Every structure is written in C-alpha cells, then in structure tokens.
Design a protein around this ligand. Structure first.
Ligand SMILES: Nc1ncnc2c1ncn2[C@@H]1O[C@H](COP(=O)(O)OP(=O)(O)O)[C@@H](O)[C@H]1O
Ligand SMILES: Nc1ncnc2c1ncn2[C@@H]1O[C@H](COP(=O)(O)OP(=O)(O)O)[C@@H](O)[C@H]1O
Ligand SMILES: COc1c(F)c(F)cc(-c2c(C(=O)O)sc3cc(F)ccc23)c1F
Ligand SMILES: COc1c(F)c(F)cc(-c2c(C(=O)O)sc3cc(F)ccc23)c1F
Ligand SMILES: [K+]
Ligand SMILES: [K+]
Ligand SMILES: [Mg+2]
Ligand SMILES: [Mg+2]
Lengths: 315, 315
C-alpha cells in the first residue's frame, strides 16, 4: 500500500543547469535523492501493476517487477540522512542498485518479446517501454551524478563534463563499433568526422554513451550487409557535428542501402529487426526526446540513410 | 493457443432485420451460432488477457476469466451440427451457458470495484466494461433467439415480438420498480404514461428489460430521497413515448431534485454512486449505443431530471 501513497506525490525535476550550480552540498544532494527516488520508483511500479495481464504474468517481467519493489523497500527503509557517515552508507546502496539493475533493458526486451503478441493493443508496450526506459535513464543520471560529486575529476562537476568534446566522444564509440563489426565481418567502414570538430561545451556524456554506439552499430551493419561481395572496400560512414547556441546536432550518414519503404513504418517499434534485439532506434529516440532533443531518420532507398541526433545545450 | 487463432477470424454480425426473415431453419441457425459464438468469445478472452495486471489478478476477475475459457472449451468441443438430434443437444449447452453466466455483471462489478483504484489509467476499465457487457448482451440475444425459435409463441419470431407495445413493457417494469421502492420507503411515485400509448411495432424486448428497470429505480429513488418529510405524497414520474419511422423515444421525467453539477461528470462512470452498485447508467448507455440508439440526460438542479432513451426501429 506504500507504493500508492508515494506515487501520489508530485516529483521535483532537476534540470542539468541546476545540477551544474566542506561537503555540505553532498548532504543536500543525498537528501534530495532520498525524497525523489522513491517517488519516481513508485510511479514505475504503478506502471508494472497496469501492464496487460498476460505480460505482467511473464516470469522475466515478474522478476524485474520484484527487483523494483525490492529497490523501493531498500530506499524507503534507509533512515533520513543526518550526517556525512549516513550519506557515505547511502552511496553504497546507490552503487548496489546501479549494479543490480544494469541488465534491466535486456530483461524487459526478452520478457516482452513473445507476450507482446497476445494483447489487443500493442501500443501499450510502446508507452510502457518509453516511460520505463526514460525514467530509468533519469534515475541512473541522478544516482551516478550524486556518486561522482564525491570524485575530484578534472573538467567534471558530477557527471557533467564542463568541456565536452563531441568529436572525442564520437571517436571513442567509433573505435568500439569498428571492433565489434570487424569481429563479425572481417572489416568495418572508416568513419570521417567533419563540421565543428573543435567544439567544446558543458554537457552530460551518459545519454551519448547509449545513443552513439547504437546508431554506429546500425550504420556499420547496414554498410557491411549491402557490400557482401567487397567487404575489403566499403563506403565510409560520414559524421557531421553542427554546434550552435540552441542545440548540438550529430548527423550519421551511411551508404548501406537505406531503410526500405515496407520497413520504414516499423523500424521505430521495439522488437522490430531485419536480422536482433530491435531496441536501438526506439530507445535512442525516447532518450533524445526525454532530454529535449530528437532522433530523425532520412532514408534514401537504394543508397543509404542519414540519422540526425539533436540534443539541447545546458542553458 | 486456440484463443489467439479463433480471435483472428472476422465475425459475421446479425442484424435484427435478418433475424426477422420442417425445422431446416433451426439447423442453419444452430450452425451459425456454432461458428459465430467462439469467435466473439475469443475476442472477449483476449480482452481479459489485456486487462491491467492488478485487475486480472483479482480472484473474482480470475473466476469470470476461467468461466469464459471453460465456455470457449465446451463450445469448441461440440461437434458440427449435422442433424436435428445434434441441434437439440446444442440447445442444452446454450441453456446451461445462459444459466451459468447470469450473474457475470455482478461478479465484474465487484472484482473491479477496489482493484480499479490501483491502476494508472482508469479509462481502460470503461472501455473493457463497455466492450464486455455489450458483447455479452449480443451473445445472450443470439443464444436466447435460437432457443426461442423452438417455441410457438403468438406475436413472436424467436425473441422478436412482432407487435411490441412500449406502453405494456413500460407498465411491466413500473409495477416491478414501484414494489422495490415501496418495500424500502413505504411508498413509491405514481407513473403516468403519455404520448404514443397505442404504438405497436416489431421489436426485441430484451434490452428494454435491462434499461427500463434501471432508469425507473433511479427516478423513484431520487424522488423518495428528495421528499423524506412527505413520503405519502411525492411527485409523479412522467413517461412520454414518441414513436416515428426512424426511432422509438422514451423520456422518463422525474421531480427528484436533479443530478448536481459536481456529480454530473461522474454519473456515467461505472461504480459511481451517491448511495449502491453504480452500473445502471453506464450499462444502459452502452446497451443503447450498441443497438444504434442513445441515452441522454438533462439535469434541472433543484427540480428533477429528464432521461431520454432512443432505440432504432427494425428496418
Ligand atoms: N542505418 C541504417 N541503415 C539501414 N537500415 C537501418 C539502419 N538503422 C536501422 N536500420 C533498420 O532498422 C531496424 C531496427 O534497428 P534497431 O532498433 O537498431 O534494431 P536492431 O539493430 O536490433 O535490428 C534494423 O534491423 C534495420 O532493418
Ligand atoms: N433520475 C435521477 N435523478 C437524480 N440523480 C440520479 C438519477 N439517476 C441517476 N442519478 C445519479 O447518478 C448516480 C449513478 O446512477 P447509477 O449508475 O444508476 O447507479 P446507482 O443507482 O447504483 O447509484 C446515482 O447514484 C445518482 O447520484
Ligand atoms: C525505472 O525506474 C526504476 C525503478 F522503478 C526502480 F525500482 C529502480 C531503478 C534503478 C535503476 C535501474 O533500473 O537501472 S539503477 C538505480 C539506482 C538507484 F539509486 C535507485 C534506483 C535505481 C529504476 F530506474
Ligand atoms: C462476454 O462474452 C462472453 C464470453 F466471453 C463467454 F465466454 C461466454 C458468454 C456467454 C454468456 C454470458 O456471459 O452471460 S451467456 C452465453 C450463452 C452462450 F450460448 C454462449 C456464451 C455465453 C459471453 F457473453
Ligand atoms: K527496432
Ligand atoms: K454510475
Ligand atoms: Mg541496432
Ligand atoms: Mg441505478
């Protein structure tokens, strides 16, 4: 019954600009998390109680539901943070929860894959995954930021990098994606980065750390699958960075044949794949829209695809 | 898995005009029911599988869900009707199902009453009850009509009365409602019937048999509750019948104080009551709209309420 009571509370949202602005600040941050996390968690548990019956009964969905109830119990059992010793122990609980739930997206994807087909309105699944995954991103950002306030890392204020270079973060994920792709196909497309390659601004890397490898793996696979006769010489994937006062734009352009007309209306659905998870595109778009940006696709059937990632700047 | 297969089939709808138009017709009717009933039932079972998890888990909701699966099993186990002896036994199954499920509305109302409060979007409950109760009405009409084709009742073709008198059916339910009301309050309002009191036309009485006592019990209770100082002399409930080529209109006008402005936006919700079931108004409106008509309310706060029941004629 505690879930219904806590879910009726508002929810004080923290904007990345508020996050940017002795150890007294650690106690105020700890107390904010103590009051905020159970409220966000209770809304998500209410979302699990509302899922279509045949889906809620799935053993994997039930397991994630139990994990989330257990997380609510541990957080609500923690006594109010009064001093530094209390805040240090609360950090341990936050680390444990971050670790215990690192594979939640995989569990949700597999628990929903077959059960999803036995319901009358599949759009409930899109709403549920969008709400759950974006709240999970927001929760993981608040939790990781609080922990990182205990570090003395240059160019960082918690998880906010004060001098983020989009070129360097893109390069980090290009090297990761090229290695996965070379392991499966024997080669990977070269990536050229152009535009505002020297841009540097305050930014939270965490959402880029999910979106970028997802969009890079897609562009590289499409390129390899459409050039099977010449895997040793495939067209480059071209990334353009456009930086302005309102937003950061990253366009990832490939020559991997495009997204077919018959598939275009389904690529943004969870579980849809032409391979195998089918989560990269709908999750990337939900994450981007949650942070005030967008993910837009331009398909040139027979040639390739342009993917546009737009993320807002920190005021 | 048989439910998902049968739910993908279309559904041949029977219009009351088709119903109006040796015993060969009994075998054709039996075979129609044999193919039609499991299709309608499979869609309703899919609706139960899609209900919010906390509702689907309710013991009473689970019981109705089990009853409906068992009904699907018995109907799908029945071998194809080839002769008169097969059709006679199928009639026994239809009587048993009509009897086993006579209290379904009560079970659904009580299984949904508390569980309803623990979900994020209560409008799913309105859609579910509207879809389930109207399909149940349609199924009970098809089943009762087939059985009544075995009777030789004057002025009837199955459940279709060829010379239905709205005044006589209104009077039948006025006597029933006045008795319930006199038992609780010591008196009941007199009912005057005016308008097309001599009208006679082909019509199916069954939906009037649900709607009329529901609207009569409401008008009588409102009248008694707003005249507690003079229960021996309360204003009459006035019913007007308007018959034309397109529809039959029955207006039930009372002087029971009206429906308050603060309640008006909730009276059409299932479970809403100022007493105690809270199903009479939303069920009556779902039934009327299902048959091509409507139920409209006009409230005169401080004076009384006019309820307008409109039902289409049989072409
Ligand atoms: N750059 C791209 N070029 C061509 N097709 C693409 C591209 N990105 C995505 N797609 C198509 O969209 C589908 C869904 O992508 P995604 O959600 O990442 O799932 P997955 O990668 O598991 O298939 C892919 O299977 C593929 O058919
Ligand atoms: N004729 C009427 N006059 C005044 N109030 C009415 C009338 N009919 C219905 N109501 C109001 O609408 C509510 C809902 O009616 P209904 O769905 O029949 O449920 P119940 O009869 O169980 O209360 C009633 O409790 C009452 O407040
Ligand atoms: C989708 O919303 C929920 C939720 F309902 C929940 F019960 C737990 C978590 C959650 C983590 C995660 O699912 O990955 S990590 C983490 C770190 C914390 F300190 C507190 C909570 C969490 C969450 F996101
Ligand atoms: C809401 O739709 C359903 C349903 F899913 C179901 F399983 C059974 C019935 C049902 C009756 C009832 O619920 O009252 S009576 C009856 C007589 C029959 F011959 C065949 C079926 C029924 C029904 F309506
Ligand atoms: K997809
Ligand atoms: K009501
Ligand atoms: Mg992908
Ligand atoms: Mg009533």
């Amino acid at each position: 019954s505690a879930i219904d009571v806590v879910a009726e509370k508002p929810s004080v949202r923290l904007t990345p600009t508020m996050m940017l602005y002795d150890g007294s600040h650690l106690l105020k941050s700890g107390r904010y998390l103590q009051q905020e996390l159970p409220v966000r968690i209770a809304h998500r548990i209410k979302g699990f109680r509302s899922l279509p019956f045949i889906i809620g009964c799935n053993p994997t969905i039930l397991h994630v539901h139990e994990l989330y109830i257990r997380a609510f119990q541990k957080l609500t059992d923690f006594p109010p943070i009064k001093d530094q010793a209390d805040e240090a122990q609360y950090c341990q609980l936050v680390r444990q929860l971050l670790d215990d739930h690192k594979d939640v997206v995989t569990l949700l994807a597999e628990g929903l894959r077959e059960s999803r087909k036995h319901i009358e309105d599949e759009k409930l699944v899109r709403y549920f995954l969008d709400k759950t995954l974006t709240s999970r991103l927001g929760i993981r950002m608040l939790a990781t930021h609080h922990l990182a306030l205990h570090e003395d890392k240059p160019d960082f204020v918690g998880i906010i990098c004060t001098r983020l270079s989009p070129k360097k973060i893109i390069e980090k994920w290009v090297d990761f994606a090229r290695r996965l792709c070379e392991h499966k196909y024997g080669n990977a497309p070269r990536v050229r980065i152009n535009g505002h390659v020297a841009a540097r601004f305050p930014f939270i890397p965490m959402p880029l750390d999910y979106i970028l490898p997802e969009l890079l793996k897609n562009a590289m696979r499409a390129t390899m699958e459409s050039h099977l006769d010449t895997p040793y010489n495939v067209p480059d994937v071209v990334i353009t960075i456009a930086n302005n006062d309102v937003d950061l734009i990253i366009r990832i352009s490939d020559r991997g044949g495009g997204i077919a007309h018959k598939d275009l209306d389904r690529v943004m659905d969870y579980h849809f794949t032409t391979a195998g998870f089918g989560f990269g595109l709908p999750t990337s778009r939900a994450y981007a829209e949650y942070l005030g940006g967008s993910l837009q696709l331009q398909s040139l059937q027979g040639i390739g695809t342009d993917v546009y990632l737009r993320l807002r700047h920190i005021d």
